[PDB]
Structure formats: structure tokens, C-alpha cells
């Protein structure tokens with residue numbers, strides 16, 4: 001079985017040499033490892049801090065048990081600094097084990113707006129990173145199943161052109177076996193009354209309106225986590241090696257040439273218990289957006305002003321750990337009548353004007369006039385280092401909103417006994433950072449600051465979207481099922497205005513756990529860390545391939561793009577491999 005093939009003893013890899021070392025056995029790391037070992041000549045070693053969890057039981061395998069695993073040893077639970085918005089620390093849920101955060105997530109499978117991905121090439125200069133290319137790799141990864149008569153009847157719509165059927169990641173409609181709740185169709189009807197679209201397939205390139213969606217699970221409803229999809233079918237390959245239960249602490253760099261070269265990694269569990277392993281070709285970082293940047297910083301790749309005071313010699317000065325972008329989530333929950341019983345999830349991808357409603361003119365006024373003031377403030381807070389380059393990101397977001405009308409907020413609906421909305425502003429203007437606070441990697445002492453709500457439009461947009469969730473819960477056809485709000489319930493008057501909501505939100509939100517950007521893929525002059533093939537600037541044989549590299553947020557759930565991203569980067573690595581013979 002797979003468990004017997006996994007390595008646990010540090011001495012089984014210590015001192016050996018492999019072609020590629022992948023730090024982190026998560027979504028991008030395992031997709032890359034499987035892809036690279038298709039060629040029998042390439043040897044790959046994956047080093048994962050956690051272990052095999054995919055067959056544990058329903059706590060991992062059933063998507064309906066979402067949330068039960070939090071706080072366990074399968075959850076890294078990274079703590080933020082004390083946030084300025086509320087003076088509290090927040091926990092960042094993140095999977096710890098083979099498959100990473102795909103072990104503990106909600107399984108939602110959707111794609112962004114075409115214009116968002118196209119801007120990676122046209123605005124950020126990443127040649128080849130456009131919707132057409134990324135979507136093609138997304139389809140290649142995908143193994144979707146169309147909905148059946150019962151599922152269609154509940155509200156599903158599936159455009160066959162927009163889904164791959166021959167790929168690797170099993171995706172299909174979640175179906176617990178009970179009846180589907182009629183609240184999903186009631187919500188659709190309520191938004192249809194306001195001229196909002198319904199049933200568009202959210203994998204097609206224009207996520208807008210209210211629709212149901214596929215989930216990453218097999219037809220028998222077992223979670224399609226990355227280790228089940230990419231590692232389980234290929235674990236017997238003799239060139240694929242997986243070491244578990246150990247942390248990668250830093251990259252080993254040789255400086256006896258013009259340009260520094262990555263030759264291996266140092267791994268371990270504590271400062272007194274560390275081992276080295278070497279790479280013939282390249283070291284690939286895939287430890288997650290909260291960790292990959294810190295691995296660079298421990299290794300002497302990052303800002304001198306951060307590293308020098310810690311007693312670390314700066315080999316390459318780069319803006320590692322800046323440009324962190326995560327979203328904020330708040331909840332609106334209502335009791336329903338018995339008539340609404342049944343399973344089902346749906347989401348409203350709402351545009352800027354749909355979110356703000358009659359406040360749209362005022363919200364547009366801010367968008368048009370404060371971009372520069374906002375960029376200066378975020379830079380003064382340490383979220384980014386170049387005001388001009390940050391202004392360009394903001395102008396790009398303004399373009400998406402005013403010219404492309406992309407979805408600005410997401411209202412995610414859960415039923416199964418209640419009407420529960422989790423809401424989030426998809427496009428934050430705040431920028432945060434993550435930096436180490438000690439030289440020892442195994443101390444795990446770092447400062448992670450997303451700077452939630454320190455940009456005024458993020459606060460206004462979140463409050464507007466959450467107020468919209470309360471409004472739509474007791475509107476049109478939903479009024480038949482509404483049996484009283486429970487959250488906020490007594491904690492915020494039912495007729496609260498927008499300014500009241502803005503005062504309530506900072507005390508009642510959670511991270512959305514979608515942090516991207518800490519090793520941003522954009523030109524060096526725009527504040528980038530990696531180039532368009534994910535190579536770290538100024539270093540040979542080192543790439544960062546995970547959620548740290550997307551330079552922007554997106555109007556969707558990110559698994560469809562991250563699986564595509566890893567496949568596209570793996571092709572680039574395969575070409576370079578043939579070049580270095």
C-alpha cells in the first residue's frame with residue numbers, strides 16, 4: 001500500500017542526490033511531482049511536513065464534514081500578528097499532510113473571469129499566461145461528470161464545452177442522496193427579479209449571477225484531494241520518492257560562480273536535528289504562500305533590511321514576502337421552515353454595482369480618486385515597496401471593475417437545515433506581508449500580516465456585500481422560507497445601515513484562507529520575485545511554484561487555476577531539463 005512506500009526516516013534520504021527536490025507535498029507540489037516523473041529518467045524527492053491522510057475516514061473523505069479537522073495535527077493553524085483592525089490575532093487554516101490544503105477545503109470548483117487571467121500577460125508582462133493558455137491546461141487537468149436529471153432539476157447547469165472529461169481531477173455534483181433544497185431555486189428567482197443572471201456555468205470564463213457548481217469528489221462522493229488524484233495512482237514509480245514528517249528549513253546555495261546556484265535543501269524538525277539532500281537540477285518550493293517566502297528569507301534571499309538584523313547574510317536582495325493578498329469572510333445565517341429542508345450549495349458572483357446597489361455612485365467616486373493615496377498608505381505600512389508599481393495593480397483592478405464588470409464579491413450559500421451565507425469581497429486593495437523574525441527555520445517564528453480592512457474600500461465592500469446577503473435572504477421567493485435571522489441576529493439590528501455594518505464587520509470576520517502573492521510572478525522592475533517560468537530572479541536552479549506566485553486575486557475558487565498553473569510550470573521545467581544535458 002501507499003503508506004508502506006512513504007519514507008519516514010531522515011537517514012534514508014540524507015546525503016543522496018536526486019534530479020529535483022520539491023519542498024511541500026500539497027496541491028502544486030504533488031501535481032508537479034507526478035508530471036515530472038512521467039519521464040522515467042527523472043528522479044524526484046518530495047519533502048512534506050505532514051503525512052498520508054487521504055484514507056483516514058469521513059473527517060477527510062466527506063466534504064460535508066468540512067471544518068471538523070481544524071485545530072488538529074492536519075491543520076497548520078498559522079497565527080497572524082495582532083491585527084490593527086481589531087487588536088486580535090487570527091488563525092490561518094492550512095492543510096498539513098500529503099495533498100496540503102486540498103485535504104481540508106470545501107471542494108468548490110469554479111474558474112475566474114477571462115479578463116483577470118489575460119491581464120497577467122498584458123499588464124504584468126508574463127508572456128504566455130493568458131486565459132486561452134491557462135484555460136487549456138485547466139481543461140487538461142479536469143475530469144468532470146455532467147449532472148443527472150435530479151441534479152439538473154435542483155438547479156445545476158453544465159456546459160460541456162467548458163469542462164475537460166479526460167483529465168486527472170475527478171469533479172462532479174455533490175450529492176448526499178437526500179432531496180435538494182428548494183431554497184436554491186428560490187434564491188435564483190429572487191435575483192432574477194432584480195435582473196441578475198442565473199445558471200451560467202462558472203467554469204466558462206464569466207462567473208456572474210447565481211449558480212450551483214461541481215465539487216472535487218468522486219462519484220461515490222469521496223474527496224478528490226491532490227494525494228488521491230496525483231500520488232495514489234503513481235506511487236509505485238521508482239523515480240518518485242516521498243519523505244514525510246520533516247520540514248524543509250532552507251535552500252543550500254553555492255556562491256562560487258557569477259550567479260548563486262541552488263544545490264539542495266536542509267530539512268529537519270529542530271535546530272539540533274537537521275539533514276541535507278542535494279539536487280542535480282533544481283529545487284522547487286511548494287510549501288504554500290505563508291511558507292515558501294520564509295524559506296527564501298531563511299536562505300538569504302529577501303530584503304537586506306529584514307535579514308541583516310537577524311544575522312543572515314543577504315545573497316540576493318528581492319522583495320520576498322510583500323504583496324500578500326487574502327480576503328475577508330463574514331456570515332449571515334437564517335432559520336428556515338421545514339418546507340426548505342434538503343441539501344445544496346449555490347453562490348452569487350456579484351458585480352461591483354450589484355454589491356453596492358444605490359451606493360454605487362459613491363463607491364465609484366472612491367475608486368476613481370483615491371488610488372494613489374491608497375498606494376502610498378499601503379507602502380508606508382510595509383505591504384509593498386514601490387508606490388508606482390502598486391498603483392499599476394490598482395489601475396488594473398479599476399479596469400476589471402469599470403470596463404470588464406467582473407464579479408467583486410461572492411455570496412456562498414449553504415442549506416442542509418438553514419440558509420447560511422459566507423460572504424467575501426473577492427478583490428481586496430489592502431496589501432500585507434510575511435517575514436521571518438528569527439534565523440532558525442525550525443522555530444517557526446514569523447510575522448504574517450494580511451492587513452485586513454486597512455484599506456477603506458475593502459471595509460465598505462465587505463459590509464455592503466454582507467448587508468446584501470441579509471437583504472436577499474428575505475426577498476422575493478426567499479420570504480417563503482425565511483424563519484428569522486440567527487447571525488448576526490441580536491448582535492446587529494435587522495435594519496442596520498451601511499455605516500453600522502462597517503462598525504460590526506471588523507469584530508465578526510475570519511480570513512478566507514486564500515492568500516496569494518508573497519513571491520509574485522511579475523517583472524523585477526514591478527516588484528516581482530519570479531519570472532514567467534517561476535524562476536527566482538538572480539538565482540540558478542530555484543523555482544517557486546505554489547500559491548505564492550499569482551500576482552493578483554481572482555473572481556473564483558483557486559483550485560482550477562492552481563492545478564493548471566502547476567501543469568504549465570512543469571512543462572517549462574521539462575524543456576529546461578532537455579536544455580541542460
Ligand SMILES: *[C@@H]1O[C@H](CO)[C@@H](O[C@@H]2O[C@H](CO)[C@@H](O[C@@H]3O[C@H](CO)[C@@H](O)[C@H](O[C@H]4O[C@H](CO)[C@@H](O)[C@H](O)[C@@H]4O[C@H]4O[C@H](CO)[C@@H](O)[C@H](O)[C@@H]4O)[C@@H]3O)[C@H](O)[C@H]2NC(C)=O)[C@H](O)[C@H]1NC(C)=O
Nearest residue numbers: 082083084085086087088089452453454502503505506507
Ligand atoms: C488597538 O490597541 C491600541 C493600543 O494598544 C489602540 O491605540 C491606542 O488608542 C488609545 C485610545 O483608545 C490612544 O490613547 C489616547 O491617546 C491620546 C494621545 O494621543 C490621548 O489624548 C487620549 O486620552 C484621552 O482619553 C483617555 C481615555 O479615555 C483619557 O483617560 C485621557 O485623559 C484623555 O481624555 C481626554 O480626551 C478624551 C478623548 O480623547 C475625552 O473624552 C476626555 O473628556 C478628555 O478630554 C488617549 O489616551 C493611544 O494613543 C493609541 N495608541 C497606543 C500605542 O496606545 C488602538 O485604538 C486599538 N485598536 C482598536 C481597533 O481597538
Ligand SMILES: Cc1cc2nc3c(=O)[nH]c(=O)nc-3n(C[C@H](O)[C@H](O)[C@H](O)COP(=O)(O)OP(=O)(O)OC[C@H]3O[C@@H](n4cnc5c(N)ncnc54)[C@H](O)[C@@H]3O)c2cc1C
Nearest residue numbers: 024026027028100101105106107108248546547557558559
Ligand atoms: C479552509 C480552506 C478552504 C478552501 N476552500 C477552497 C475551495 O472550496 N475551493 C478551492 O478551489 N480552493 C479552496 N481553498 C484553497 C486551496 O486549497 C489552496 O489554495 C491550495 O491547496 C493551495 O496549494 P499550494 O500548492 O499552494 O499549497 P498547499 O496545498 O497548502 O500545500 C503546501 C504544502 O506544504 C507543506 N509544508 C508547509 N511547510 C512546509 C515545510 N517547511 N517543508 C515541507 N513541507 C511544508 C504543507 O503541509 C502542505 O502540504 C481553500 C483553502 C483552505 C485552507
Ligand SMILES: *[C@@H]1O[C@H](CO)[C@@H](O)[C@H](O)[C@H]1NC(C)=O
Nearest residue numbers: 158159160161162201204205
Ligand atoms: C457553452 O460555452 C461556449 C463557450 O465555449 C459558448 O460558446 C456556448 O454558447 C455555451 N452554451 C451552449 C448552449 O453551448
Ligand SMILES: *[C@@H]1O[C@H](CO)[C@@H](O)[C@H](O)[C@H]1NC(C)=O
Nearest residue numbers: 352353360361364401402405
Ligand atoms: C455601475 O454604476 C456606475 C455609477 O452609477 C455607472 O456609471 C456604471 O455604468 C454602472 N454599471 C456598470 C455595468 O458599470
Ligand SMILES: *[C@@H]1O[C@H](CO)[C@@H](O)[C@H](O)[C@H]1NC(C)=O
Nearest residue numbers: 386387388389392525526527
Ligand atoms: C517602481 O515601479 C515602476 C513601475 O513598474 C518602475 O518603473 C520603477 O523602476 C520601479 N522603481 C524601482 C526603484 O524599482
